[PDB]
UniProtKB/Swiss-Prot annotation:
Belongs to the fibrillin family. Glycans are attached at N26. It is linked to Marfan syndrome: A hereditary disorder of connective tissue that affects the skeletal, ocular, and cardiovascular systems. A wide variety of skeletal abnormalities occurs with Marfan syndrome, including scoliosis, chest wall deformity, tall stature, abnormal joint mobility. Ectopia lentis occurs in most of the patients and is almost always bilateral. The leading cause of premature death is progressive dilation of the aortic root and ascending aorta, causing aortic incompetence and dissection. Ectopia lentis 1, isolated, autosomal dominant: An ocular abnormality characterized by partial or complete displacement of the lens from its space resulting from defective zonule formation. Residues 8-60 form the TB domain. Cleavage of N- and C-terminus by furin is required for incorporation into the extracellular matrix and assembly into microfibrils. The C-terminus, which corresponds to the Asprosin chain, was initially thought to constitute a propeptide. Fibrillin-1 and Asprosin chains are still linked together during the secretion from cells, but are subsequently separated by furin, an essential step for incorporation of Fibrillin-1 into the nascent microfibrils. This is Fibrillin-1. It is found in: Secreted. It comes from the Eukaryota. Disulfide bonds join C10-C32, C19-C45, C33-C48, C34-C60. The chain holds residues 2052 to 2125 of 2871 of the full protein.
Amino acid sequence: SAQDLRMSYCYAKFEGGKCSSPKSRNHSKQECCCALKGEGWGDPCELCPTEPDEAFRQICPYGSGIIVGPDDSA
């Protein structure tokens, strides 16, 4: 589904320099800014894109959903 199905740490907040709120478990960079829609992704947090940015959809073909964080909310 994703690129090299890389599943690292997804951060919920990216301080245009660092990150915070990393999910104990790891998910695909797509599952991070798509289903988890955080602020950054990967151990080396990388600022995730936002819709409808070409990059945004680059991880979410259908949109913020795909595999909405299973048993990871509600």
